[PDB]
Amino acid sequence: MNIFEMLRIDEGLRLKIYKDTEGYYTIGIGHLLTKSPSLNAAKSELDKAIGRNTNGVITKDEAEKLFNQDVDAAVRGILRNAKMKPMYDSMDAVRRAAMINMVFQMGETGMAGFTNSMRMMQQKRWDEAAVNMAKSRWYNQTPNRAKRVITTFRTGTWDAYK
């Protein structure tokens, strides 16, 4: 297991534009296109992401390209950040992959409300952090994936993914 295989399992793969749990247009491996309700808008967004006239469908290779870009941007968002960088630096490889999963799904911005739980993590209060983490719109919206993620952060193992 690795961050790519983890996220691939959590995001799934869809070649046609679809709407996530909150109504937002997405495609490929969890690539959010837009928060707009207009499909047309999402379509534009896709052509710009891909660099071609797509009409809402992409190839697997294209999907994987956006995913490389997305994981890279996530890692970068962590690294760039003043509070997250340090938090990332202090974690083992497994917990580092979990945090990257979070950021990919929620962004630097979503991550901000997780400050306390992250801090708990830093203090080795796994269990507490975990319960805390489940108390979020994040978990509530997509509990299965969130449960995997939390488990990973909690334990430092890949059990949730086997």
Active site amino acids: 11, 20
Is 66 among the annotated ligand-binding positions? no
d(CA 16, CA 152): 30
In the sheet that 31-34 helps form, which strands lie side by side, from edge to edge? 14-19, 25-28, 31-34
To which H or E segment does residue 32 belong?
Answer: strand 31-34
**Any contact of residue 125 with K ion (CB under 5 A)?**
no
Contacting range for K ion; rule: CB under 5 A; set: 3-11, 41-49, 96-104, 137-145: 3-11
Q: Show the tokens assigned to 133.
A: 């983490």
Residue 99 near residue 88, CB atoms below 8 Å: yes
Q: Is 117 annotated as a binding residue?
A: yes
Residue 42 interacting with K ion (CB under 5 A): no
Give whichever of 39 and 73 is closer to Cl ion, judged by the CB atom.
73
Return binding residues: 32, 104, 117, 132
User: Which residues are part of a known binding site for substrate?
Assistant: 32, 104, 117, 132
